[PDB]
């Protein structure tokens, strides 16, 4: 709400010298990136991580932007890593996929969680369904997603999270099944173009 107004209104004005050095850290770290899953973001060991310093180019007051989906009246703002505190803010970028500027080879995760009383986050993920549109906006554009495949897996499981060779996707993650919390359920988009008005 108030933070995606702030996210936006800080972005718009922001340099154009400013925003491209911020993209180059950001494509150099994609480009160099290590993709390992570092792990489930509901386990013990992934609660009580520390501070997440690997996005702060990307970052406007530590947000790296916000995932907008529509068709559920979703907009949250998103965080690097994914310990508890930043699951109980928003979203939490996955620790070893793509930072979320897409282009060709890219595969970025953000995850949040669901079925909580006190904000809705993901809760309303599994009404998304193939040929569903999202949005992710970050410091330099807004880009769409249009959802191709949504599948449960077992927490561990992490193959179809890395990189899909010669593909641009966003997946969004949390828990299911509906108050069980068992298993994950990953809705996959990939990139198409877009022009915001």
Known sequence: ?????????????????????RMKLAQAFNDSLNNVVSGDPWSEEMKKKGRAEYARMLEIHERMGHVEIPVIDVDLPVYAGTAEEVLQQGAGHLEGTSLPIGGNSTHAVITADTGLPTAKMFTDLTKLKVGDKFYVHNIKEVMAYQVD??????????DDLLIVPGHDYVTLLTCTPYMINTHRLLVRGHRIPYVAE
């Open 149 to 158: 495949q949504v599948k449960v897996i077992e927490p561990t499981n992490f």
């Open 1 to 21: 709400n108030q933070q995606i107004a702030d996210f936006d209104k800080e972005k718009a004005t922001l340099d154009e010298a400013d925003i491209d050095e």
